[PDB]
Amino acid sequence: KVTREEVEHIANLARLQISPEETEEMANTLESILDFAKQNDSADTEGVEPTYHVLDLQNVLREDKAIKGIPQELALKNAKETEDGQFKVPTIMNEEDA
Amino acid sequence: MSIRYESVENLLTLIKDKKIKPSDVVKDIYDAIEETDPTIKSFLALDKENAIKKAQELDELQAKDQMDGKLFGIPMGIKDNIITNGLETTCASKMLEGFVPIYESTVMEKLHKENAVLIGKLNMDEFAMGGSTETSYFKKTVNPFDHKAVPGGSSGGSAAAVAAGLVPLSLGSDTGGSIRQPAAYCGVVGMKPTYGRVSRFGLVAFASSLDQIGPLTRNVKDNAIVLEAISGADVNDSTSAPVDDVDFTSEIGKDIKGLKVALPKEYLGEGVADDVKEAVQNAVETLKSLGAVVEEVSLPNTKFGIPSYYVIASSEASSNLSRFDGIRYGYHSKEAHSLEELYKMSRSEGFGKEVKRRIFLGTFALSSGYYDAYYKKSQKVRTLIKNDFDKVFENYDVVVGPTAPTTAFNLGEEIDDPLTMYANDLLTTPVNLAGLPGISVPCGQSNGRPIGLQFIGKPFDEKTLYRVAYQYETQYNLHDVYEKL
Amino acid sequence: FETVIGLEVHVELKTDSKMFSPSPAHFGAEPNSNTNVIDLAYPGVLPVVNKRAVDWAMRAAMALNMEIATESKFDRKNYFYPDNPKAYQISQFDQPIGENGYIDIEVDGETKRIGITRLHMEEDAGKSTHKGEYSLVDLNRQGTPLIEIVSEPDIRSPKEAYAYLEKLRSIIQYTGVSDVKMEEGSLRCDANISLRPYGQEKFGTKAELKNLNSFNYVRKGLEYEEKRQEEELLNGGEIGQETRRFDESTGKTILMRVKEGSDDYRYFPEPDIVPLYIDDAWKERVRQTIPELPDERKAKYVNELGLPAYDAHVLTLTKEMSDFFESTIEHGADVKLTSNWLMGGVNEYLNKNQVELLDTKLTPENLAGMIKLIEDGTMSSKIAKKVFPELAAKGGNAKQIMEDN
Numbered sequence: 006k007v008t009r010e011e012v013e014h015i016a017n018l019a020r021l022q023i024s025p026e027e028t029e030e031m032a033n034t035l036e037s038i039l040d041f042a043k044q045n046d047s048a049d050t051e052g053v054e055p056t057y058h059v060l061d062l063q064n065v066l067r068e069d070k071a072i073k074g075i076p077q078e079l080a081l082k083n084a085k086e087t088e089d090g091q092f093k094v095p096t097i098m099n100e101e102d103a
Numbered sequence: 104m105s106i107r108y109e110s111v112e113n114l115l116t117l118i119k120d121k122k123i124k125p126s127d128v129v130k131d132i133y134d135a136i137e138e139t140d141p142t143i144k145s146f147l148a149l150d151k152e153n154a155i156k157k158a159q160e161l162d163e164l165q166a167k168d169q170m171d172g173k174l175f176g177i178p179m180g181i182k183d184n185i186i187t188n189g190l191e192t193t194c195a196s197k198m199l200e201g202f203v204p205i206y207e208s209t210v211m212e213k214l215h216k217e218n219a220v221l222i223g224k225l226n227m228d229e230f231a232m233g234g235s236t237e238t239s240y241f242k243k244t245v246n247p248f249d250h251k252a253v254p255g256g257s258s259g260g261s262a263a264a265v266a267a268g269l270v271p272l273s274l275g276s277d278t279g280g281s282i283r284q285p286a287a288y289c290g291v292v293g294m295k296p297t298y299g300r301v302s303r304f305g306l307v308a309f310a311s312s313l314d315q316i317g318p319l320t321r322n323v324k325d326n327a328i329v330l331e332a333i334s335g336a337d338v339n340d341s342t343s344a345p346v347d348d349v350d351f352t353s354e355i356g357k358d359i360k361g362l363k364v365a366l367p368k369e370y371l372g373e374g375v376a377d378d379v380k381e382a383v384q385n386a387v388e389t390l391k392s393l394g395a396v397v398e399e400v401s402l403p404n405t406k407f408g409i410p411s412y413y414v415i416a417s418s419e420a421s422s423n424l425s426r427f428d429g430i431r432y433g434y435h436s437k438e439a440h441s442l443e444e445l446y447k448m449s450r451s452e453g454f455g456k457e458v459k460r461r462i463f464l465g466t467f468a469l470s471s472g473y474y475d476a477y478y479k480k481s482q483k484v485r486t487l488i489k490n491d492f493d494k495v496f497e498n499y500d501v502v503v504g505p506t507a508p509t510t511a512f513n514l515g516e517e518i519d520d521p522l523t524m525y526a527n528d529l530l531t532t533p534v535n536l537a538g539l540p541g542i543s544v545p546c547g548q549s550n551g552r553p554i555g556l557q558f559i560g561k562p563f564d565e566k567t568l569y570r571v572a573y574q575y576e577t578q579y580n581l582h583d584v585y586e587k588l
Numbered sequence: 589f590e591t592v593i594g595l596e597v598h599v600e601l602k603t604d605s606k607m608f609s610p611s612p613a614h615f616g617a618e619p620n621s622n623t624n625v626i627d628l629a630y631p632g633v634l635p636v637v638n639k640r641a642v643d644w645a646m647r648a649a650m651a652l653n654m655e656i657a658t659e660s661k662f663d664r665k666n667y668f669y670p671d672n673p674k675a676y677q678i679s680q681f682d683q684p685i686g687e688n689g690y691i692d693i694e695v696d697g698e699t700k701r702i703g704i705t706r707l708h709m710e711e712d713a714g715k716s717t718h719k720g721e722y723s724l725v726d727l728n729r730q731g732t733p734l735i736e737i738v739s740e741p742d743i744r745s746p747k748e749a750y751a752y753l754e755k756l757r758s759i760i761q762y763t764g765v766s767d768v769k770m771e772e773g774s775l776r777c778d779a780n781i782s783l784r785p786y787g788q789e790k791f792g793t794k795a796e797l798k799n800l801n802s803f804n805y806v807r808k809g810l811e812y813e814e815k816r817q818e819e820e821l822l823n824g825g826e827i828g829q830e831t832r833r834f835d836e837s838t839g840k841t842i843l844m845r846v847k848e849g850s851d852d853y854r855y856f857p858e859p860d861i862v863p864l865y866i867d868d869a870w871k872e873r874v875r876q877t878i879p880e881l882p883d884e885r886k887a888k889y890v891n892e893l894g895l896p897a898y899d900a901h902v903l904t905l906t907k908e909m910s911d912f913f914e915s916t917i918e919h920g921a922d923v924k925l926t927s928n929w930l931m932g933g934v935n936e937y938l939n940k941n942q943v944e945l946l947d948t949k950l951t952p953e954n955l956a957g958m959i960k961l962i963e964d965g966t967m968s969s970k971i972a973k974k975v976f977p978e979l980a981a982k983g984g985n986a987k988q989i990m991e992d993n
């Protein structure tokens with residue numbers, strides 16, 4: 006029972022634009038895959054610790070020695086919108102469209 | 104084209120004996136691409152100009168008789184989710200079309216250090232998500248053994264380029280089988296080294312916990328060589344393992360008499376087709392004819408491989424693909440007038456259907472209310488899966504089985520059915536979940552389409568893997584078939 | 589009707605390089621010139637943990653009487669923003685390096701032990717300058733090592749909140765891991781406040797106060813908010829979860845948004861960073877790397893060198909000030925006298941001239957003299973009027989200026 010609501014809420018968390026025309030289609034697929042996810046429910050995990058890392062390495066730290074940043078020009082080279090040495094973005098952060 | 108089929112090893116020697124000039128090696132490669140890729144379509148951006156220049160340098164070094172490198176005048180194709188500084192890296196996505204890296208990935212660093220020659224980037228499934236490579240925003244690569252079949256995914260281009268006599272070696276990435284399955288489909292040799300065996304600096308991530316770079320080649324030996332050139336530890340990757348011994352060729356040629364080979368019953372299970380199953384069983388008998396001891400075992404949590412894998416991989420993807428806002432690089436929506444729009448539009452328009460499926464699934468599996476039941480549960484199942492191997496490994500040296508349930512399927516046969524598409528990862532995902540090294544080598548053909556035989560090893564023991572793989576290879580291979588296509 | 593409030597404080601660690609990237613932690617005025625592929629969140633980049641940042645994080649946590657974790661990993665706090673390029677801030681969720689500690693404070697009443705529930709390592713975000721109907725983004729500061737300190741909700745008044753920030757700032761300052769100045773952003777603070785009428789367990793509305801830029805300023809918003817929801821509770825009020833911005837000019841808090849629930853950050857272990865296993869030896873090295881903190885330094889000024897109650901607090905307000913005072917003490921300066929001289933006189937000189945760099949202009953070596961000259965040599969004070977200033981911003985001995993003048 007993945008509802009129309011949850012779909013639109015996930016898209017927001019993922020920052021993905023979705024249309025009612027898509028939302029429905031997605032509610033269905035999302036569901037299907039989840040029932041694909043349910044298979045794990047037949048697996049017995051009582052007392053099993055979650056696996057976060059596959060290896061054993063421990064405490065890998067780096068020394069506090071700086072390295073000059075790269076040229077501003079390099080750091081901007083691939084951005085489509087940049088104004089005066091900085092990434093330019095909209096912030097008419099208001100109501101019908103934040 | 105002359106040497107378009109020389110193995111890395113033979114080509115290497117052909118260069119050191121001055122019987123061939125690096126510049127010509129390269130001419131032959133691009134001739135092959137011009138003639139063959141129109142139909143195969145394994146390549147994306149080519150680096151011809153640069154390749155030619157480096158080869159010209161190489162001629163000098165050849166004449167001055169100073170040829171350093173484990174690889175040297177060796178052409179190399181590279182998967183498009185692996186950063187090449189200066190060379191356009193798209194991940195086969197609209198989201199990155201046009202993107203030119205400004206830093207160099209560690210394996211390329213190593214590869215260049217060894218003097219290999221970068222020929223170009225290989226096509227793949229978008230952001231490494233797929234099992235056929237059909238999701239590519241640019242082209243649909245095809246199987247050199249059958250032009251109506253898929254080359255596998257996500258590293259389809261890497262498997263196809265090698266099988267097509269385009270390059271002697273190629274790099275791929277494997278998250279749940281993206282290196283082995285394509286190899287199995289194109290009847291080529293592909294290795295997904297143990298987790299940590301190869302740095303991920305420059306590997307455009309999907310699943311930090313499951314990803315890994317590895318080589319694809321036309322034979323076991325070449326594969327081992329290439330793995331020795333990209334393996335070591337790296338200060339740029341905290342998870343790169345500090346294992347100094349990288350000689351993987353030390354035992355190729357040694358016999359496997361007495362080798363304890365575990366054959367889990369779940370690998371010849373119900374989802375495995377009849378032809379694939381027949382080939383592997385014959386493969387087992389071949390192994391028996393060679394001294395190794397092969398007995399049945401059980402990896403009971405195998406059935407959960409695909410489901411826990413997708414929950415886990417998607418979840419991580421739901422995070423690793425977030426940097427794509429189109430602000431600093433990548434596709435940037437023109438019609439965006441709001442910051443929300445900028446994010447939502449650039450990502451929805453820049454990502455393909457399958458990628459958005461994973462993200463959606465991932466974000467949900469990770470969200471409040473569902474976290475423990477969907478993501479947490481998976482991580483636990485992951486432990487179950489590794490446990491299986493731990494147990495089996497107590498009494499066995501290696502694990503054998505088929506790489507994929509079936510031979511390559513048809514163009515568009517499953518591109519519209521992710522559920523059946525996913526099922527093809529039955530025998531590969533457990534490896535990544537447990538972090539083990541796994542390798543695929545051809546073991547047959549059914550209607551001309553190759554079948555893969557997979558060897559899973561103990562952590563960091565790829566040398567044994569190559570040893571048994573080589574021995575089996577002396578009894579079967581497609582070594583002389585590639586030349587005829 | 590206790591007004592229950594807690595404080596979320598971030599501290600900028602002053603390391604050479606950033607938390608998960610070798611970029612320098614100190615940048616110039618040129619935007620986006622203090623970055624690399626890591627800070628810029630380029631595809632395929634990985635985080636590399638700054639060792640000193642960890643040492644300093646667990647140095648400050650001990651100084652905060654917290655239990656230091658043995659196993660501590662990092663986690664991803666996921667959210668989209670132009671200042672957070674990866675779209676996730678590498679932080680800590682479970683296993684924060686430090687837990688359950690406290691600090692003692694004196695509020696008008698007598699002593700109160702306020703608990704500090706946790707301390708975790710994070711990375712700072714970039715800065716987003718709002719220009720026109722657009723926004724400019726500078727990633728120079730992105731990645732700067734921060735540490736988050738969250739108080740137990742034990743605070744009970746806008747004044748206890750101030751006292752808290754002062755002691756905390758004071759203690760962190762002594763560990764030499766941060767200049768902890770709010771005017772410089774190396775110390776930040778957010779407050780959470782809610783009122784629950786006695787006899788019952790239910791609370792009224794709860795609010796997160798944002799844009800509190802000075803110790804003095806948090807109190808303003810805190811006590812205003814307190815009165816604001818004091819009315820709401822009584823008059824009619826509609827219970828709710830909210831975030832509020834404090835207006836520096838008007839002194840009021842403005843409702844900037846109403847929470848629909850709990851912000852979902854999809855926290856999960858950072859696979860790119862191997863776990864930390866902090867052993868005893870390690871804990872020792874950093875244990876020993878801690879001086880005498882303010883409280884025990886002040887208790888030292890009480891019975892031994894029996895100084896007053898006011899004096900003790902202000903002389904231990906900073907490590908440098910307190911060191912200065914003790915260096916000048918053995919020298920030959922009468923404890924009280926130097927005390928009275930630093931308490932006021934020098935303290936007022938510093939504030940009036942904003943010479944906060946107490947270590948370059950005058951010295952315990954130079955000041956030690958002035959106090960003797962006043963003490964026995966030449967007779968009494970009037971003279972100290974200007975001998976001090978010159979002696980503070982100019983020379984080295986005021987028993988050379990009384991003369992050279």
Ligand SMILES: NC(=O)C[C@H](N)C(=O)O
Pocket residue numbers: 231232233234256257277278279280281282416528
């Ligand atoms: N490609 C892989 O490594 C795994 C799986 N086939 C996917 O698309 O996620």
Ligand SMILES: [Mg+2]
Pocket residue numbers: 598710736
């Ligand atoms: Mg924080």
